[PDB]
Amino acid sequence: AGLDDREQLASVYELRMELEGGAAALAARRRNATDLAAMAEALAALEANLDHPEQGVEHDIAFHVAIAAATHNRYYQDLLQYLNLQLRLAVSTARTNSRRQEGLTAVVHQEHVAVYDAILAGDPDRARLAATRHLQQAASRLRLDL
Amino acid sequence: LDDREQLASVYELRMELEGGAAALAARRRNATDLAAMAEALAALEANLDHPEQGVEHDIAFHVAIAAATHNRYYQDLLQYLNLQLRLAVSTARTNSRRQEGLTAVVHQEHVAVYDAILAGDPDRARLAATRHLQQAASRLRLDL
Numbered sequence A: 001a002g003l004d005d006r007e008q009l010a011s012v013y014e015l016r017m018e019l020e021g022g023a024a025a026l027a028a029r030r031r032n033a034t035d036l037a038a039m040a041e042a043l044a045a046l047e048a049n050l051d052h053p054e055q056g057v058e059h060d061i062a063f064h065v066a067i068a069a070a071t072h073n074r075y076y077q078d079l080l081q082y083l084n085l086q087l088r089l090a091v092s093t094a095r096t097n098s099r100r101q102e103g104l105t106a107v108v109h110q111e112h113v114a115v116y117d118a119i120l121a122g123d124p125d126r127a128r129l130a131a132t133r134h135l136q137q138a139a140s141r142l143r144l145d146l
Numbered sequence B: 001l002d003d004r005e006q007l008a009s010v011y012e013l014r015m016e017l018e019g020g021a022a023a024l025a026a027r028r029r030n031a032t033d034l035a036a037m038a039e040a041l042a043a044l045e046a047n048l049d050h051p052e053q054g055v056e057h058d059i060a061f062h063v064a065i066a067a068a069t070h071n072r073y074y075q076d077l078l079q080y081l082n083l084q085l086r087l088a089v090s091t092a093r094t095n096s097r098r099q100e101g102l103t104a105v106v107h108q109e110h111v112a113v114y115d116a117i118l119a120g121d122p123d124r125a126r127l128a129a130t131r132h133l134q135q136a137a138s139r140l141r142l143d144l
């Protein structure tokens, strides 16, 4: 049936909330200094992209992919790769929408930072919470009604 | 034997994928989903006597829960990981036949997931599904 429709979009964030919540938990328990570099590298790129958010798309996906790689679980990275088009459709639709309200992108940036600090700090439940919050808020900014 | 580390990563991933699916199914299941899960449980109940195709009926049970999410990406990922599922399930079920009343204990773990989903209790569903994988990982002496 093809996969750009809004039911699709709600399904993507629905799946992300589980998959990326779990991945953040494992990452907080298993991340090495290389993983943290990969996450901070993506954040720094996003910080420079706050003014113009269509280049932010790849850096946004890249931040979440690094979180998946920080699980040290071979299967998690593959699932995110297998879903890369769905990730893009969700991340792209959202970053367009949030450039509409002033400063909203700076606010979304801190949703990412919150996931990074929790994973740095070693706290799995804090990491899972922050990751499910970036997504819940992203879906709610899009009125998806999960 | 030397594949403990890879079975643990499968069970690790299943725990997040299937916990989330079971909670989703508890919210969205319909009467067709219930029948599909219940028929699978009945097939697994019969396989206590004859072990043939028990792996397929176990997997068909977890696949049915994924269908009951009514989110197409849960089914795709489980189909995508079918080979990993088969290797874990078949490893676990042969190991479980080795101890006398073990496979009946496992059958109750499956039932408990269906019961939570039938009740429409997503937190209960999520815990039932992950307890099943945890205990299955314990039975295999893996260390998440």
Ligand SMILES: O=C(O)CC[C@H](O)C(=O)O
Binding pocket: A060, A064, A090, A091, A094, A095, A098, A108, A134, A135, A137, A138, A139, A141
């Ligand atoms: O919601 C936004 O403004 C950006 C999208 C978010 O970063 C995501 O990963 O889906």
Ligand SMILES: O=C(O)CC[C@H](O)C(=O)O
Binding pocket: B058, B062, B088, B089, B092, B093, B096, B106, B135, B136, B137, B139
């Ligand atoms: O642990 C067992 O004996 C059964 C394994 C379980 O059904 C599974 O889904 O992996």
Ligand SMILES: [Cl-]
Binding pocket: A046, A047, A105, A108, A109, A110, A112
């Ligand atoms: Cl950002």
Ligand SMILES: [Cl-]
Binding pocket: B044, B045, B103, B106, B107, B108, B110
């Ligand atoms: Cl069973």
Ligand SMILES: [Zn+2]
Binding pocket: A060, A061, A064, A112, A134
């Ligand atoms: Zn994001």
Ligand SMILES: [Zn+2]
Binding pocket: B058, B062, B110, B132
């Ligand atoms: Zn099972």
